[model samples]
Target chain A: GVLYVGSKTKKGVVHGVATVAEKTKEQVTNVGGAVVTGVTAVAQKTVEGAGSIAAATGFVKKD
Target chain B: GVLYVGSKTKKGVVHGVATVAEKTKEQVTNVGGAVVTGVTAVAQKTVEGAGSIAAATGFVKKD
Candidate 1:
């Protein structure tokens, strides 16, 4: 029973750990991209929002 | 009347545009930091979660 359990454990380590690492790495990479995109959207909105406020307050001259 | 309006417009352009640009630039810079932090958190979580799952499933050999 001990020998069987040890063999099974070795098999799991050799195969399973690598699979999990690869999958998680891919998922995290995608999440990082989404986070960057989300940040960019917020940055764009900040610029646009400021521009709008400036226009409404007559702070920006209309050309 | 036209001279007065022109002077006011110039003042607005000089002061207001700079103020708005400064505020927006600061806000965007802060948001960029937050985005990087968020992505780093996701990456950390993914690695930890995968390791935990592997350990629980007997995929990681205990030393």
Candidate 2:
């Protein structure tokens, strides 16, 4: 729904699209960071399991 | 900061924490999958060089 055609291809439109796409691409990184926060919240639990798994699997302090 | 007030409320809080953490945990997986797009972006160049590396090391389809 983002594409529009004009009788003449405006140079400004090309630059505008690039700028918007660049920003849009990065804006999602903000979302990834929030997920990192969610993982942090969940991590208090997950960390327990990770330690259990690591200890059992000889991945921790085995060196 | 997701603190609470009552003992009964605290018991109920356990279920919500698991559900929220489960959903939140999965939501990050979705975000990471999009980052698979980022990896796919990086992989094209990586694959090219990997092919080159393999060929030089005689690790290619010479068989």
Candidate 3:
């Protein structure tokens, strides 16, 4: 009975559940965005480190 | 002086240089954003690794 009523009121049931899920998804995406924002400043350093390590280890040309 | 004349047109001068620098900054930021986005997935792995290493070294309680 409840499931059928929920199905009948598709706008209320479906959208109410889906919109919350979408909001949660959006919230997590921004948190992930924050991490990426943090990482961006450091990646240039990482890129330099990668180059230096590769050169010393013979994985890349020093010159 | 040419420098004074350049500065006289503040709209064309200051904004012109500032805008290009801003664009370049934005461009590189997105590139870095790409890197950190790449790192976010791996950071979860890193967090897991941190937990495992700390536990094994007795720096953290496993249970």
Candidate 4:
């Protein structure tokens, strides 16, 4: 019989992907303010939503 | 007749306020990834728009 086990790379990958997502998001928002009218409101909503998603994923990974 | 002249504080205020906006945007994006589906796209747009606004404002102040 063979036993299977997970590795740390799983967590690493999840966080790594999430980190890239976060960085890209940051770069986009940084540019939004100057080009779009009423961007503040839109940007705020996007940020809030993204933040929640990231937090949830992290929590699940931890659990 | 007295003429009103702008002070350095004007630029300071603009950049200061913009800086706050940027920081808030960053914080929001940081948390967004795990909570929202398609947030990466939204966040990126928001950041780009914001960055444009900030850069434009900075340019105006300089001019």
Please report the candidate that would top lDDT against the real structure. 4
**Where does candidate 2 stray beyond 4 Å?**
A1-46, A50-63, B5-63
Clash numbers, per candidate: 0, 0, 0, 39
Backbone clash pairs for candidate 1 read none
DockQ, model 3, C-alpha based: 0.03
Better of 1 and 2 by TM-score: 2
TM-scores of the models, in the order given: 0.12, 0.14, 0.12, 0.12
List the lowest-lDDT window of 10 residues for candidate 3 chain B. B1-10
Tell me the interface RMSD of every candidate, in Å. 31.7, 23.9, 25.1, 24.7
Task: Identify the superior model by TM-score, candidate 1 or candidate 4.
Answer: 4
Compute the lDDT for candidate 3. 0.16
Q: Is the docking of candidate 4 incorrect, acceptable, medium or high quality?
A: incorrect
State residue B47's C-alpha deviation in candidate 3, in Å.
12
Write out fnat for all predictions, comma-separated: 0.02, 0.02, 0.03, 0.03
Clash pairs (backbone) in predicted model 3: none
Evaluation by TM-score, superior candidate among 3 and 4? 4
Tens-place lDDT digits, model 1, residues A1-60: 011101111111011011112212111111111232211012111122212211111112
DockQ of each: 0.02, 0.03, 0.03, 0.03
Candidate 1 CAPRI assessment class? incorrect
* Candidate 3, CAPRI quality class derived from DockQ: incorrect
Model 3 lDDT tens row, A5-56: 1111111100100111221211111111112221111222112222222111
TM-score of chain A of each: 0.11, 0.12, 0.11, 0.12
Candidate 1 residues B42-62, lDDT tens each?
A: 111112221222111111223
